[PDB]
Amino acid sequence: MTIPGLNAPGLVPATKKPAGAKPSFESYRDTSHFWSSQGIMDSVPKV
Amino acid sequence: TSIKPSAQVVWPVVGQEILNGDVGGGFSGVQITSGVFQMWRASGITNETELYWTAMGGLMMSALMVFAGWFHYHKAAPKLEWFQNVESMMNHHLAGLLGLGCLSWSGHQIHISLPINKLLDAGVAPQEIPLPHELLFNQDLMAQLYPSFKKGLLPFFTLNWGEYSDFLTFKGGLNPITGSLWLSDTAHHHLALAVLFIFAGHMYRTNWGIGHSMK
Amino acid sequence: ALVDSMEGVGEETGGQIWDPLGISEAVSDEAVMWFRASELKHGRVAMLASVGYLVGAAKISFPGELAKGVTFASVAANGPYQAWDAVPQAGKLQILSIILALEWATEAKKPHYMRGGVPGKIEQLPFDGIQGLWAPKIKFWDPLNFTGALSAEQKARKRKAELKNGRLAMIGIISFITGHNLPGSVPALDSSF
Amino acid sequence: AKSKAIPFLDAPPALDGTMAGDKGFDPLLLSNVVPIQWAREAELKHARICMLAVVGWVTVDLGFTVPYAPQVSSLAAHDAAVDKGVFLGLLIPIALVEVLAGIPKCFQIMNEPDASPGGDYKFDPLGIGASAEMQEKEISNGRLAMLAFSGIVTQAALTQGPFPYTYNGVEDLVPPMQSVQGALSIL
Amino acid sequence: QFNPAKAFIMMFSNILIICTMSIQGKSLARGTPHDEMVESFGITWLLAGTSLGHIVGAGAILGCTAAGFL
Amino acid sequence: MSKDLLKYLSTAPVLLTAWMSLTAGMIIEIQRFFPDSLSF
Amino acid sequence: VVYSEALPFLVRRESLGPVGALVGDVGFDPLGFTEILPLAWLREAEIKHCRTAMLATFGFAFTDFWHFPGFDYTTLEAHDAVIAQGGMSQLLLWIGLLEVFSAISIDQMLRGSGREPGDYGFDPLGFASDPAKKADLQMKELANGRLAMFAFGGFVTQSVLTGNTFPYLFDYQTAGDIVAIAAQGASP
Amino acid sequence: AISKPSNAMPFLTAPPCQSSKLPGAETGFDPLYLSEFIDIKWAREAELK
Numbered sequence: 006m007t008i009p010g011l012n013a014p015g016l017v018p019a020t021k022k023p024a025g026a027k028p029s030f031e032s033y034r035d036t037s038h039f040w041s042s043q044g045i046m047d048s049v050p051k052v
Numbered sequence: 053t054s055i056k057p058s059a060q061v062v063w064p065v066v067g068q069e070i071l072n073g074d075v076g077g078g079f080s081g082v083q084i085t086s087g088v089f090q091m092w093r094a095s096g097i098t099n100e101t102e103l104y105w106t107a108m109g110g111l112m113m114s115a116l117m118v119f120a121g122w123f124h125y126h127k128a129a130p131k132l133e134w135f136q137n138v139e140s141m142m143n144h145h146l147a148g149l150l151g152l153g154c155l156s157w158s159g160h161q162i163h164i165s166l167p168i169n170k171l172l173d174a175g176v177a178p179q180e181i182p183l184p185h186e187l188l189f190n191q192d193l194m195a196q197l198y199p200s201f202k203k204g205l206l207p208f209f210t211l212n213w214g215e216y217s218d219f220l221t222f223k224g225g226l227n228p229i230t231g232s233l234w235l236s237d238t239a240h241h242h243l244a245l246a247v248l249f250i251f252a253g254h255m256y257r258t259n260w261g262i263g264h265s266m267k
Numbered sequence: 268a269l270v271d272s273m274e275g276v277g278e279e280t281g282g283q284i285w286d287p288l289g290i291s292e293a294v295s296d297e298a299v300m301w302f303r304a305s306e307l308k309h310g311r312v313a314m315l316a317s318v319g320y321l322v323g324a325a326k327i328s329f330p331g332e333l334a335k336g337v338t339f340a341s342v343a344a345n346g347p348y349q350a351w352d353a354v355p356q357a358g359k360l361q362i363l364s365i366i367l368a369l370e371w372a373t374e375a376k377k378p379h380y381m382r383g384g385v386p387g388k389i390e391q392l393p394f395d396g397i398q399g400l401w402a403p404k405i406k407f408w409d410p411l412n413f414t415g416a417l418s419a420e421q422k423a424r425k426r427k428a429e430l431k432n433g434r435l436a437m438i439g440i441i442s443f444i445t446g447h448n449l450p451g452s453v454p455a456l457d458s459s460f
Numbered sequence: 461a462k463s464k465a466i467p468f469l470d471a472p473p474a475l476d477g478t479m480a481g482d483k484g485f486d487p488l489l490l491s492n493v494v495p496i497q498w499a500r501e502a503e504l505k506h507a508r509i510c511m512l513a514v515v516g517w518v519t520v521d522l523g524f525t526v527p528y529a530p531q532v533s534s535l536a537a538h539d540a541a542v543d544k545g546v547f548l549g550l551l552i553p554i555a556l557v558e559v560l561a562g563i564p565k566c567f568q569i570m571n572e573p574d575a576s577p578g579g580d581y582k583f584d585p586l587g588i589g590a591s592a593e594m595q596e597k598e599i600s601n602g603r604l605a606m607l608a609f610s611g612i613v614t615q616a617a618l619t620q621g622p623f624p625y626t627y628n629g630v631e632d633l634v635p636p637m638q639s640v641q642g643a644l645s646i647l
Numbered sequence: 648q649f650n651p652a653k654a655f656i657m658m659f660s661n662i663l664i665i666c667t668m669s670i671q672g673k674s675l676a677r678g679t680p681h682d683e684m685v686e687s688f689g690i691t692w693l694l695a696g697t698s699l700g701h702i703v704g705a706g707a708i709l710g711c712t713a714a715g716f717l
Numbered sequence: 718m719s720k721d722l723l724k725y726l727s728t729a730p731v732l733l734t735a736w737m738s739l740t741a742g743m744i745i746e747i748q749r750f751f752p753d754s755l756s757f
Numbered sequence: 758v759v760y761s762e763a764l765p766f767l768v769r770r771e772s773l774g775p776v777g778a779l780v781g782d783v784g785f786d787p788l789g790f791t792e793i794l795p796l797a798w799l800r801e802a803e804i805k806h807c808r809t810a811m812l813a814t815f816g817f818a819f820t821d822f823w824h825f826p827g828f829d830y831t832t833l834e835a836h837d838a839v840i841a842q843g844g845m846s847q848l849l850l851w852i853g854l855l856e857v858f859s860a861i862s863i864d865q866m867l868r869g870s871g872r873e874p875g876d877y878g879f880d881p882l883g884f885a886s887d888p889a890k891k892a893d894l895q896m897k898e899l900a901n902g903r904l905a906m907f908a909f910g911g912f913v914t915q916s917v918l919t920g921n922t923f924p925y926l927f928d929y930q931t932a933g934d935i936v937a938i939a940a941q942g943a944s945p
Numbered sequence: 946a947i948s949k950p951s952n953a954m955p956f957l958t959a960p961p962c963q964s965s966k967l968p969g970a971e972t973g974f975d976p977l978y979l980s981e982f983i984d985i986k987w988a989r990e991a992e993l994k
């Protein structure tokens with residue numbers, strides 16, 4: 006595997022978008038874990 | 053009509069998994085017979101997030117009730133003089149509990165249950181239904197659905213209550229679509245009962261001179 | 268502290284406290300100290316603003332680049348009012364940051380002008396005595412110590428001059444802004460303003 | 461014994477003469493049923509809200525507007541702000557101030573015997589002073605602002621007109637700007 | 648509210664209830680002076696009187712509207 | 718978790734419920750991992 | 758008559774204790790939670806929230822810039838992604854061991870062992886070993902953490918609202934002029 | 946201000962095992978305080994086993 010520091014970089018720079026318009030409220034509410042049906046169904050434990 | 057209501061699922065351990073029978077809707081589970089699905093449809097719940105959040109609210113209320121029970125015995129317990137105020141208890145239970153409960157439920161019906169249920173009966177699928185918060189304050193949409201809403205509360209404050217005939221009815225019978233009572237009838241019912249209970253709750257004596265003594 | 272002992276009464280208003288309204292009579296003492304501190308702040312701000320506005324209208328600008336690709340002439344060409352908008356956002360962000368630091372430091376000194384401090388006497392070395400912060404001991408006022416060669420009476424006279432110049436500066440800077448906004452409100456302001 | 465404001469009624473005992481703005485005016489004796497400190501807290505809260513409301517309404521109707529705000533009269537300003545979206549934001553400081561200064565102060569007024577008087581939040585950052593004449597001025601300005609706001613709303617809604625809120629503008633406030641030629645006719 | 652007749656019915660109902668009501672055997676219609684009523688009950692007198700007056704006036708107004716008039 | 722609460726947890730019904738809970742869970746997990754054992 | 762130093766129009770409550778038993782006592786308790794809950798429990802919760810909020814805001818800001826080679830997720834989707842991977846299970850396990858030990862300490866402190874509200878004794882580097890500096894450093898801890906709660910709330914909320922990485926500022930705030938003086942129009 | 950805190954944890958009280966003559970008794974690591982319930986000699990026998 007990638008040991009961080011030994012056989013790979015340490016902290017790696019993150020990927021970012023250069024600014025942007027405000028996402029619509031329904032864009033993230035419909036994917037939120039508490040105010041979306043599919044979000045609620047996915048907000049469950051796993052084993 | 054075709055979907056069998058089911059809100060319980062068994063786990064596969066010792067062969068009990070067959071009890072998750074075919075209940076329609078691509079779901080395997082134990083069919084329920086408590087009518088809660090129809091209750092929620094009447095209330096206007098169309099999503100699962102609403103059910104989740106009202107469940108969380110119910111848990112919060114249960115915690116508050118445990119706290120209240122502990123507080124009212126271990127920190128601040130009332131006296132027998134407080135308990136024996138039967139007149140004020142009746143006044144607050146009539147006007148305050150029953151009356152305001154009926155008034156609040158009538159408001160909830162008039163604002164959230166009539167539009168959602170009417171759209172569902174018309175044929176709008178639950179995804180396209182406008183949300184209750186949108187319906188609560190969008191008076192233009194409520195005027196589109198029930199034309200009397202465009203007149204505001206002036207027909208209430210003035211006694212032109214006949215203007216609200218569309219969403220406050222005495223139709224009776226059963227709705228042909230759902231085969232149940234008209235929700236406009238139920239809203240008018242709860243409003244009338246709220247008025248009746250608030251009127252009844254001003255009977256018994258309290259700190260002020262007016263009122264009855266049951267003795 | 269009290270308006271009778273405070274300076275600023277000039278000759279233009281007859282050797283008398285010029286309070287046409289009953290503000291000084293109606294308000295308490297610490298309100299007067301707050302008013303004096305605000306008066307001095309307004310006068311000093313407006314003096315700097317008036318001089319800068321006159322410079323911008325005259326189009327006198329430093330030889331160089333305000334930012335890479337943005338020349339002082341480029342930002343100053345359109346006028347004084349539009350130069351601030353033409354400035355890049357980061358530069359005036361830095362300006363408002365240092366002004367935030369200056370205001371907070373001057374307000375943080377404990378002999379407050381409202382609570383037993385001289386109103387209008389901004390503490391020199393405002394960034395001194397602050398834990399977790401070091402700044403060079405450059406006095407906010409008179410870093411070259413020009414006032415050291417002045418007597419107490421001369422300093423009082425120059426404080427009177429400060430107040431009477433600051434009031435004119437407030438009038439002048441509002442005249443500039445009003446003339447630019449509503450043309451013809453303030454004559455003596457040509458198209459350059 | 462007889463009330464100053466009403467010279468044909470006996471003044472209540474709760475009013476006395478210490479409270480600011482006291483004119484012996486309480487024909488319904490509401491100070492007996494309602495506590496005087498609670499009533500004064502309500503009076504000052506209403507007075508302050510109505511003062512702010514009057515000045516804001518007049519400014520917005522005359523033309524002063526914040527950048528990006530809808531350029532509408534004060535009558536439609538509520539609907540325009542709600543439509544544009546930024547109006548719960550103003551409720552947030554209102555909710556903060558109320559929940560953390562009115563509810564505790566109200567409970568202290570009702571229950572705690574040692575408490576500040578109604579409407580006294582000790583809010584004097586400038587130290588202008590809470591003198592008796594200053595409190596009287598506050599009460600008078602506040603009451604005048606309450607009645608003024610009531611008239612302003614009820615007249616702006618009725619006429620849908622500019623700042624005077626009258627059908628013919630300043631001519632209604634000033635009859636001799638109308639003609640005067642009928643007055644001179646009868647003379 | 649709108650009509651003058653609606654207002655007249657409401658005001659008459661309130662006046663009738665206020666002048667005919669009894670509290671603890673004390674009524675204006677049963678020779679109890681107004682001073683005694685005010686001293687005994689106070690603002691509760693008017694509040695209860697106009698509350699029931701509003702109830703009966705609303706009933707009368709709605710009934711007259713249903714019959715045809717208001 | 719004072720000595721009094723430890724005593725209360727040590728009371729007979731709480732201990733019965735705890736032990737039978739562990740026993741039922743043991744049986745059920747043995748069923749999950751070795752299911753349908755109508756023999757040895 | 759003692760008035761709360763944060764709200765001078767309210768009397769101190771009573772359950773807040775002697776004025777100054779707790780560093781930061783500015784008497785700020787308008788809603789009177791100290792009557793319902795015990796002050797030691799409330800203060801343990803306060804310091805736990807302070808410390809967690811500090812670590813959370815620093816981690817959010819850090820993850821906005823840098824991440825380890827394995828985790829190639831943004832800060833918002835990191836929670837879901839590392840639950841799917843399984844790392845958040847490990848964090849929950851270890852923080853739960855630590856929290857079980859912590860809860861045992863809260864139980865002992867409330868039953869009267871003598872432990873202070875949030876004194877775990879964690880002081881390896883020797884900061885605050887001198888008693889003179891200990892109260893000042895407690896006050897600084899509380900101030901920084903109470904700031905950090907609002908910091909993290911603003912971080913998350915503005916991050917989701919805007920969709921921008923570090924500053925959590927709209928595109929118009931970042932690009933345009935937030936110090937303009939020429940008359941604006943309808944939109945930013 | 947714990948009078949007799951655990952050596953391993955200064956924020957927890959001393960368990961019974963800490964005030965004992967067993968090898969390693971000068972550590973006081975027992976957050977669940979199972980030395981109070983379990984006989985320490987039996988527990989050490991099981992530990993070593």
Ligand code: CLA
Binds near residue numbers: 160163204243
């Ligand atoms: C308790 C029950 C109840 C409740 C809560 C409501 C609530 C409402 N009814 Mg009413 N209604 C009821 C019973 C009830 N009704 C009954 C029984 C009837 C039958 C007679 C009616 C018949 C009726 C009609 C015909 C109409 C309403 C309407 C309204 C609205 C009135 C707004 C108002 O007066 O603000 C009162 C304002 C204040 C007291 C001042 C404070 C203002 C606060 C600070 C504002 C807070 C705003 C909020 C938090 C944020 C919104 C933001 C937005 C962008 C989403 C509101 C949604 C109107 C409507 O909108 O219909 C859709 C309408 O036309 N109702």
Ligand code: KC2
Binds near residue numbers: 333334354357359
């Ligand atoms: C209040 C006065 C003031 C102070 C005390 C001050 C101090 C420092 C220090 C501290 C020692 C540093 C290290 C520094 C650095 C830079 N300053 Mg700066 N500065 C002040 C004012 C302005 C203005 C008005 C502008 C500006 C700028 C730049 C740029 C250009 C970058 C570029 O070329 O893009 C860089 C690198 C310009 C800018 O940001 O342009 C986009 C710009 O317009 N500064 N500045």
Ligand SMILES: CC1=C(C#C/C(C)=C/C=C/C(C)=C/C=C/C=C(C)/C=C/C=C(C)/C=C/[C@@]23O[C@]2(C)C[C@@H](O)CC3(C)C)C(C)(C)C[C@H](O)C1
Binds near residue numbers: 009859
């Ligand atoms: C302080 C405090 C508290 C607290 C706290 C909190 C919130 C602490 C949080 C700590 C935190 C957030 C610590 C993260 C560590 C991450 C590690 C070690 C990562 C390992 C990662 C490993 C080993 C591997 C990663 C991989 O990508 C690698 C390299 C190769 C890839 O093939 C894939 C895999 C996945 C294998 C209490 C207890 C709540 C209350 C108390 O009052 C005060």
